[PDB]
Swiss-Prot record, chain A:
Assembly description: Binds to host ACE2. RBD also interacts with the N-linked glycan on 'Asn-90' of ACE2. Cleavage of S generates a polybasic C-terminal sequence on S1 that binds to host Neuropilin-1 (NRP1) and Neuropilin-2 (NRP2) receptors. Interacts with host integrin alpha-5/beta-1 (ITGA5:ITGB1) and with ACE2 in complex with integrin alpha-5/beta-1 (ITGA5:ITGB1). May interact via cytoplasmic c-terminus with M protein. May interact (via N-terminus) with host bilirubin and biliverdin, thereby preventing antibody binding to the SARS-CoV-2 spike NTD via an allosteric mechanism.
Entry protein name: Spike protein S1
Sugar-bearing residue positions: N40
Function: Attaches the virion to the cell membrane by interacting with host receptor, initiating the infection. The major receptor is host ACE2. When S2/S2' has been cleaved, binding to the receptor triggers direct fusion at the cell membrane. When S2/S2' has not been cleaved, binding to the receptor results in internalization of the virus by endocytosis using host TFRC and GRM2 and leading to fusion of the virion membrane with the host endosomal membrane. Alternatively, may use NRP1/NRP2 and integrin as entry receptors.
Gene: S
Amino acid sequence: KNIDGYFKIYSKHTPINLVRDLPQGFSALEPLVDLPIGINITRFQTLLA
Amino acid sequence: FNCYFPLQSYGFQPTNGVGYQPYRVVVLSFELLHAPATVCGPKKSTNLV
């Protein structure tokens, strides 16, 4: 997300045994980094390998 | 004739007068833009009670 020119990230990593779709459970994400960038972001792209 | 090379070299020798002695100048340009502020002065952090 980007709010008031401050881009924020919330990261959570937990192991799960999954096949397709998603598991059923509750999760609370935690801060990762704060990036006072302040640029307009209208779109994004996922980079793969 | 009527054609010259604009760049000229500064004569530098230790025997030159103090007035013409080379001086290294560092010019700091302070500009406040619409972007957020980062660089700030030092801190204090006095004793705790």
